Design a protein around this ligand. Structure first.
Ligand SMILES: Nc1ncnc2c1ncn2[C@@H]1O[C@H](COP(=O)(O)OP(=O)(O)O)[C@@H](O)[C@H]1O
Ligand SMILES: Nc1ncnc2c1ncn2[C@@H]1O[C@H](COP(=O)(O)OP(=O)(O)O)[C@@H](O)[C@H]1O
Ligand SMILES: *C(=O)CCCC[C@@H]1SC[C@@H]2NC(=O)N[C@@H]21
Ligand SMILES: *C(=O)CCCC[C@@H]1SC[C@@H]2NC(=O)N[C@@H]21
Ligand SMILES: [Mg+2]
Ligand SMILES: [Mg+2]
Ligand SMILES: [Zn+2]
Lengths: 57, 77, 449, 449, 77
């Protein structure tokens, strides 16, 4: 009876390798974002529209 | 009492570093503003903060076991 | 072969993908919300992950949460299905760069084809006929707009190029409201699809919705399956499909299939997609391409024997097309009648708890749904609660089997659109085959004294 | 065309016939008992007639009551289906003379073929191979019996020529009990089938149950569909069928189909029938013919697209065969797993009330049953409560779909044989394809210390 | 009270002949052994007999309307 089934835990350990330089964080809101997307949006967090640091050049 | 639940889904830890001390301890009471555990996602270790003060009744989680949203982690009385 | 994928969807299509994965021997990863913790496919999966609260914005449109779930479980690909993140090009780009495989077209083709004006321009570049029109978003000059409209011929319609889902488009009858209608359509497109681009196209009064499903592996191979016909539309959204369509002789079928295959070859398409058209006196008019597994996919599997999701899972695994042009055989006919939990007349969703459920069953009846006894319909997502097919040997046989199944089919506890389905089946023009797109609206009628 | 027929049966086959009648536009007459007043097909019929109390002898075996019901309702034909009065030759004669049309073979052919020894003699007359044996009921001389047994080769089996239903037959290992076994088999045949005729036939140890479905209109036309294979038998009764069978190359398929068609032409057969065989190293051995719609009929419809009940209703209407030999195409594979309300291990029927029911659904799943929520299973008839098919593209796909459906399928409140079905599916030899008839019994094993 | 039910299925009548008198009448009481109606089957008019004596409370059937097994025909109190 799959209607009454409990939820087992996910696999304790699996080797997953996401590239390290494709995710950032916004302490103002908390929504994780795509680094290249953010860099293409003039360093503006698209979710909460909170501006961040930008290189002078 | 009140039980803290992780608002995100990812790998769970207790020490912020591979060789360090856990943020909190069972027994000794904790306050409203404090970090209790780390729920890492996409290699970005985020912190978990309680909201009520009280004695640490028990810890319902173990290091290295992934958890999800609305998962009771640590109960505070 | 993809060792383990992620069902980046919910509901009926999620269950269908789960069944196909278990058929092909691919393991399962279930991602769900907190409200949908008793979904059929969720309970019938090895690994269940909850990635947000009840609202769609926080749970299923949370691309970071989906990628986190795909990282923790060790998957190497993700299936979006239809809806939600089906056509999100940025989602495809992130999944490609995150280290996994996107089951669908490359993000570049998603950008090129999802935007309607770019898709029409590319189709004209490939020689596929398109509706004459502006071929570009118009400005604030009413004189230019009316000149273009007179060039193409009134009436005209303004549709959001980044629009979809049966909204974001307004029909213009005359110049007395053209500018205001264009501005408000642009505002609606801003509010819905985050794009202000709106264009002008020739408006037809007696069309026949004809669409062709196609497949391509992106390696110089392009095959086309049989046609479709969704003449029974409500609010520009389909309610009763059928495939192949009446009147479309095999000569025209091959003639348009070759053109669609050439278009897929030129664009370098990958995955499962369909080229919509508009049919009248032998003329086809491309208007849009859906670069995803279309909801009315079963009415093509049963008339060809080819499982679309299996094709997508094989293509995403890199295997070349195992089926050639001559190895596709059109044998039969089909009808499909969606079931929704809305109000039959007022079209208000009626969520709640289901008390009694009973599948039709029988020869040629294929009931795609996740509803069950005690399943509480959540008031948080689309109103679809199941699809229903009755494959026959000719159109009349299919209609008869659909009538029998609808008599057998029982859903109690919430409001259902079964009565409208019965009325549509009983209609003589519908049973004849070949009604116009607005036929449903003409049968709808209007107010009364 | 038959304007209105009578469903001279109950349950699953009754519902299937009702659906086929409503498909072909033929009206419906429902004949039922007093216990089965809430059957699905009974409730889904225009005219319901109750022709007896709970016991089968007083209600469904009451030929006068059936003919009375067919007279009051104005029908012009009656469909028996399988079981009950399927092979009652006298029933066919009475229905023919009562003024109606019997959907099935002429009573003369029923008499000639139902009796096993006469059927074997006729098959040998037509050239169809048969098991070497007595070719006639033996007497009380043990010397003659053992001489014949040595002529054909031990071991030997005694089967009731008027017998059937997996009973009325005993296997003989040696002469130490031959006479007693023959006498007790004759007594059982007297107690069951009202006939004392018992015969001797060669007994095989490693057979493969192969049977071929055929159709004929009695007007010089005889067509044969694809084969079947019921290797998984329990107590000589089928539990898991499949069609076509492994190893049977199209050369052998055509070779035996031509012979079966010639046999049907010579006998002047009418209606839907199947020629059973026994397969070993390329040799076929006819043992019996079922002159009715066989229960495992779906596994031939789905691999050919031809509806058997529609064929029977057209033939009984006098229309010639609309399908020729070259117009039958074998495309696919199938598996079927009956569902019974018996005890999984002890094989004791477990009637009662059903609490929760849920059909599998999905691509290629066809669920034939009448059970529903709250349906009370009567403790008065056969233990079958539904059939289940999963049509695939190859055997492995079909097995996978069956496994998925059985996981999805839920029947609660009464004991079901689903667990045995799962165990059979999980077996490696079964998934390989080509097991022997006793394979099931070898997997059964025996007592323990 | 007790209601007589036809044990067979077929055409129903009240007069044994096309032009005759019905076997019983509403009102006036009837006894255990009596014929009350005809349920014809295959052109063989058979008789229906009650089993208890009492007053004819009402007649629940009409001539020419087919009935079946376990069908209450006439109620006797
Ligand atoms: N140029 C047109 N002329 C007439 N009807 C149209 C036209 N464009 C769209 N429609 C109607 O709207 C339906 C949906 O159009 P489509 O562009 O596919 O929008 P969506 O993205 O909302 O599905 C079509 O099937 C058709 O019935
Ligand atoms: N001569 C035989 N040798 C081996 N097995 C047999 C023989 N005859 C019958 N059987 C077994 O019994 C099954 C049923 O036989 P059949 O004659 O069709 O009896 P029934 O009328 O009960 O169906 C066959 O499928 C086969 O497995
Ligand atoms: C990434 O490559 C692995 C490091 C993740 C955190 C490490 S591994 C276990 C250590 N203890 C702990 O709480 N976190 C540390
Ligand atoms: C057979 O051909 C018809 C005769 C059946 C009985 C007749 S018809 C109606 C008459 N009244 C009655 O009670 N039975 C008579
Ligand atoms: Mg569209
Ligand atoms: Mg048999
Ligand atoms: Zn932010």
């Amino acid at each position: 009876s799959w209607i009454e089934r409990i939820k087992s835990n996910i696999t304790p350990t699996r080797k997953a390798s996401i590239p390290e330089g494709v995710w950032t964080k916004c302490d103002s809101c908390g929504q994780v974002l795509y680094r290249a997307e953010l860099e293409r949006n003039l360093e503006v967090c698209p979710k909460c529209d909170h501006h961040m640091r930008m290189t002078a050049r | 009492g009140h039980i803290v639940r992780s608002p995100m889904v990812g790998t769970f830890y207790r020490t912020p570093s591979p060789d360090a001390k856990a943020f909190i301890e069972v027994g000794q009471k904790v306050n409203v503003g404090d970090t209790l555990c780390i729920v890492e996602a996409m290699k970005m270790m985020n912190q978990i903060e309680a909201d009520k003060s009280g004695t640490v009744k028990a810890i319902l989680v173990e290091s290295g076991q992934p958890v999800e949203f609305d998962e009771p982690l640590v109960v505070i009385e | 072969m993809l060792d383990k994928i992620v069902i980046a969807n919910r509901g009926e299509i999620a269950l269908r993908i789960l069944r196909a994965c278990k058929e092909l021997g691919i393991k399962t990863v279930a991602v769900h919300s907190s409200a949908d913790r008793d979904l059929k496919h969720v309970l019938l999966a090895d690994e269940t992950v909850c990635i947000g609260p009840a609202p769609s914005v926080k749970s299923y449109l949370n691309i970071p949460a989906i990628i986190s779930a795909a990282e923790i479980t060790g998957a190497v690909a993700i299936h979006p299905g239809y809806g939600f993140l089906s056509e999100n090009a940025n989602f495809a780009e992130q999944v490609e760069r995150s280290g996994f495989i996107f089951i669908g077209p490359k993000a570049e083709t998603i950008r090129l084809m999802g935007d309607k004006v770019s898709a029409i321009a590319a189709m004209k570049k490939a020689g596929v006929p398109c509706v004459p029109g502006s071929d570009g978003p118009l400005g604030d000059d009413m004189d230019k707009n009316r000149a273009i409209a007179k060039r193409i011929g009134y009436p005209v319609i303004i549709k959001a190029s980044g629009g979809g889902g049966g909204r974001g488009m307004r029909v213009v009858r005359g110049d007395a409201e053209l500018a205001q209608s264009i501005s408000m359509t642009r505002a609606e497109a801003k509010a819905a699809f985050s794009n202000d681009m709106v264009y002008m196209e020739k408006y037809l009064e007696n069309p026949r919705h004809v669409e062709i499903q196609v497949l391509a592996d992106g390696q110089g191979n392009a095959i086309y399956l049989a046609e479709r016909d969704c003449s029974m539309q409500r609010r520009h959204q389909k309610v009763v499909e059928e495939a192949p369509a009446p009147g479309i002789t095999p000569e025209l079928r091959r003639y348009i299939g070759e053109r669609c295959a050439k278009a897929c070859v030129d664009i370098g398409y990958r995955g499962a997609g369909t080229f919509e058209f508009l049919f009248e006196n032998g003329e086809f008019y491309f208007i849009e391409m859906n670069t995803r597994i279309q909801v009315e996919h079963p009415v093509t599997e049963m008339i060809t024997g080819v499982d679309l999701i299996k094709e997508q899972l094989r293509i995403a695994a890199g295997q070349p097309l195992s089926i050639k042009q001559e190895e596709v055989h059109v044998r039969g006919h089909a009808v499909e009648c969606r079931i929704n939990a809305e109000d039959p007349n007022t079209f208000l969703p009626s969520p709640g708890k289901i008390t009694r459920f009973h599948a039709p069953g029988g020869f040629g009846v294929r009931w795609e749904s996740h509803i069950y006894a005690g399943y509480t319909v959540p008031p948080y997502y689309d109103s679809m609660i199941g699809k229903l097919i009755c494959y026959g040997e000719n159109r009349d046989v299919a209609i008869a089997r659909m009538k029998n199944a609808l008599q057998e089919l029982i859903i109690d506890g919430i409001k259902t659109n079964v009565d409208l389905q019965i009325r549509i089946m009983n209609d003589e023009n519908f049973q004849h085959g070949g009604t116009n797109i607005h036929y449903l609206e003409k049968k709808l009628g209007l107010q009364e004294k």
